[model samples]
Target chain A: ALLEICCYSMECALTAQQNGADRVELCAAPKEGGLTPSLGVLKSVRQRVTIPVHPIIRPRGGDFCYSDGEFAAILEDVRTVRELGFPGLVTGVLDVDGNVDMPRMEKIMAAAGPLAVTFHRAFDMCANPLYTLNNLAELGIARVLTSGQKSDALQGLSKIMELIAHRDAPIIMAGAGVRAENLHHFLDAGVLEVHSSAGAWQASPMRYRNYSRYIVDGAAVAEMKGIIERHQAK
Target chain B: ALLEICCYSMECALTAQQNGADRVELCAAPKEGGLTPSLGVLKSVRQRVTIPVHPIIRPRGGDFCYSDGEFAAILEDVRTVRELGFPGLVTGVLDVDGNVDMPRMEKIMAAAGPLAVTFHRAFDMCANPLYTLNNLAELGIARVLTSGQKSDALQGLSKIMELIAHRDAPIIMAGAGVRAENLHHFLDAGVLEVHSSAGAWQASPMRYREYSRYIVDGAAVAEMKGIIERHQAKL
Candidate 1:
């Protein structure tokens, strides 16, 4: 039942909160597939917002198959963030064969004990998503974020609905192209949570031009809000 | 004269150590301009090698301009690395206009007190290398890795010699296109230090074979050793 907004800046997170979002996903370098935001950004967002903020733990934008060293880097990052008291963490890792690296996942999960963890969209890259979903279930992950292994969540609704029915360990969080227009589709499909940026790519008068282009598009948010309201009425 | 080999993997670092590299620049994802290496890699390498290892402090591989938040992140990273007992740090920051951000640099330098700090290649991106060199000199930076604003050290040999003559703060460490073939050229130019990855690219060995046509062919250590020996003779 939670709506997590992908925030590019503190302003975006505030806007999402004002627009009825339950939480925000804090990240920087969204241009690089959402590298970990600066500690200051994460701290500022956590300080300014009452809602829970879960920052992405990706080191850089590229393939998710991490080397042993990269895995250690991620572990260090997790410990650092956990100490800062961020309520949730988002990350994913795959082996060379494009399947979940359970051993690595177990190590990360153990390191991240007492912190909520969500498997990120690197799930889509797996050769078999259902198998991956079941694996996540076995892994005791809190949630699995996916666009249903498709270009957009709407396109993968069937698979998403299937996974929701099949898995007990992870809550299916439909994301990647979820917008106001199709809120009903996901809602009716029994998805408990949805994710969207809900901001515009274009500039706004209130935005700092140097950083504002990084915000999500407004039209996108308007559409998402409209859908959320309609679903609420139903 | 120390030969610093850039290592993207433990395997590469081990090889460099075995081959007598004086130091290793530990990093990951060299293809994206070298992101930070993981702690596991750092710890393992630190335990495995007797030689000094300097970990790169780059948060991401892009323009030198960092968000205020990113700057704080770098500060935290310096604290983290120092606590872990790293002997040296490699980092750099630049303003939007491509000049060194001295205040930010000073902050990092302060956090890294008692540890060696080398200004990274972000030095080369400055619009004016000489002006920037003097600025770093004033900041009391330990050393700077630069190709004298040229694409390669060979192209900027004269400028480097000029920097060596003028700058008081940073020792000029020539890198990025420094190799055995051109080692003597830099030494003859009176260069003090050098850096090399010794012809390794970020691509996996299999990927290298798959895309052999596109891979860059550069100098290996054998060629570098010959150049180093030739330079030693002149010394």
Candidate 2:
């Protein structure tokens, strides 16, 4: 089992690495459900952390339906991350009617080249899960991030179990609302990859906080990492 | 008066522009009060919006103080922004004792070259605003984003006026919590520039609602713009 942590900044990526996380999924604008992180974030995080850092390559954070320009941006980001020497990328695409856009997925995957690809949580939004999973395997996608088409992992545990049971090709990683509290549910089910932000609010030093924002908490990350290690095959 | 909108993502940047914002202070994590946004964000935004985009270059959210690597990262970001053919950047660095770190500021300014630099709200945390203002002017920072050392622009108004009166250098852009409601106060005060997110929570379409986030609200921005135009240089 791999404790794959999703991080929003270079600091968080370093924290995930320091706390024994096996991998870090670097993305920007976590509120929008993990868009492709900035180029600076990619290079800076890769330089700082040794753990295999795979960047989520969703250009913008809405539905998987992306404009042609947005798709082009994703490809450009793929080339940028590749040039930065990252090991893998996490991305996926869906047609308007809501199935895997295999043609576009093929292009994103091809642009990814030798770098491993993990089709992201866009799988959950797919109109058909079982069908999309089969197509992803056919595409040789290394993994799939899905909540089994539920709002979150806990609510969709049975669906997660069903997908994991397929054992066809792609590894099923559960994400969204994953933290120190609920990670136990997935870890107990013998799931292979679990994605979490362990995100929290940091206190700004100023007297009055102008805005409320979230950052990855090292404490939460460490606690979650410990829970996984104790249960996973050491 | 100018409306410098704070934007977190490419979508928000486009929102700020479409709504008549004069410029955008591009940031990475709005929750963290803003950091130096990613290279992708800067490039994508610059290409997407014709309006001048200046990115905030704080390495982290906690304090203005930075370690050697953090400072190195900030400088690299400055160079990266410059290389991308941007006309300006928004950044500031401070010493641990709650004062401007002049030496590092010089290096940062040198890297920024002629590109405009705005010492950000980190100045609000400084030990002495008046002294830092003089130092920033000497450093040739083009502008300063502050909430008058208060949390939001309204509470900081008194000191904001004081700083504006001193008027040695740098445009005093009252930032923090500038909205349509309090925008009149600053505009009526004859302030030249104001910074705001005029921002609001953009509800995620995601079923699970994993992260509660904020983005520039076009209506809020436009209303604030309306208030500014109604007040600026009125004959």
Candidate 3:
């Protein structure tokens, strides 16, 4: 299975690439759970890293139901990502009733143009998994990231396996709490790609430290990559 | 005097503009003292807010001294801001000895091109205020943000006045801990512009509520704007 690491900073993304992750989901505001990354980071990462970089198109950390203005920002962001020449982007929207906001999704799709779209964890928040999955497939989404409606993919392994078994389902990238130790389970389930934060907190280098940052651990990425290589070899 | 409010999100930038702040220093990670804002927030704020939006270009929230990669990222950020058509950008860097990093600053100057540049609060952490002020003047920085080397601008009022008194000094914009209540001091100091966060903590609208956000208070911004307007009217 391919490893896609969620990174909050340019440094983290570079580390992920150097350590053997296949792709990066560049984002910001880690405390708020992966909002859109800054343009500087996007440009720098795109310039430096050779791996596929998919920036998350989230406006803020909240429920997926965005106000009209928020949705407009999301569209504008999608256009910006497309114009910058990214290969893919990650985002999702839900209606007030907890179903796919088809109208807004269509707009996002329109804005994305040739860029591939990955429906992020907002899939887990949807009212019905199978119903949402089918709609996403109809919309031609490239992939769906979920823990099978559970908080962690390992706990939701059975549901994940079930989703992948469906013929109409889009690519199911198992994510949330995924690590090297639990790699065998997802591998056994035959997932095509696995997403992990590979996150570790380190103190800032400032003499007067006020905050410790959450960054991707290079060692962790290497270990998971090693496991995947051995699994493929076997 | 103009009022520039620090903003962390697009919503907060709108609030700042609606309430009459003159400009915004768009940034992220309010807890880490304002890192570079996400591109989505930058584009959204630029498209929505008519007021000048100067995005902060600092990579992280720690000290001003940066590693080679961090500085490279900073330069790349400067170019991005300039290409995005912003009128100005905010950033500063220091050497290990706490002096302004002149070489990096020159590269930043080249990257910025026609965009106005503001040396941010990294001014406060410098080794010598006057020495830093003279160096920035030589570099032709548009303005310098300082709390007078004090934790708050009010406490650093004397040093702020001293910097402004120099013939070669750039525009002195007093900032940090500035609020409507203390607006008179900076006004009386004859400073041309003042910066404030106008910050207030609001709970997120999400049902789960994992975090509360630091947003610009519209009323607070209005209050300060009102004070500045009145101050200008008296002359």
Which of candidates 1 and 2 reaches a greater lDDT? 2
1 against 3, candidate with superior lDDT: 3
Clashing pairs in 3: A38-B39
Stretches > 4 Å off in candidate 1 = A6-21, A26-50, A57-65, A167-169, A179-189, A197-230, B9-15, B28-32, B36-50, B167-169, B180-184, B198-226
Clashing pairs in 2: A39-B40, A213-B31
DockQ scores of all models, one per candidate: 0.18, 0.19, 0.26
For each candidate, the alpha-carbon lDDT, in order, equals 0.73, 0.79, 0.86
Task: Please give, for every candidate in the order listed, the TM-score of chain B alone compared with the true chain B.
Answer: 0.88, 0.96, 0.97
> Given candidate 2, what's the lDDT at residue B145?
89
Tell me the TM-score of each prediction against the true structure: 0.79, 0.79, 0.87
Highest lDDT scorer: 3
lDDT of 2 by residue, B5-32 (tens): 9887777888889998999888765555
Sorted by lDDT (best first), the order is 3, 2, 1
TM-score winner, 2 or 3: 3
Q: What fraction of correct interface contacts does each candidate retain?
A: 0.10, 0.09, 0.20
lDDT of model 2 at position A226? 82
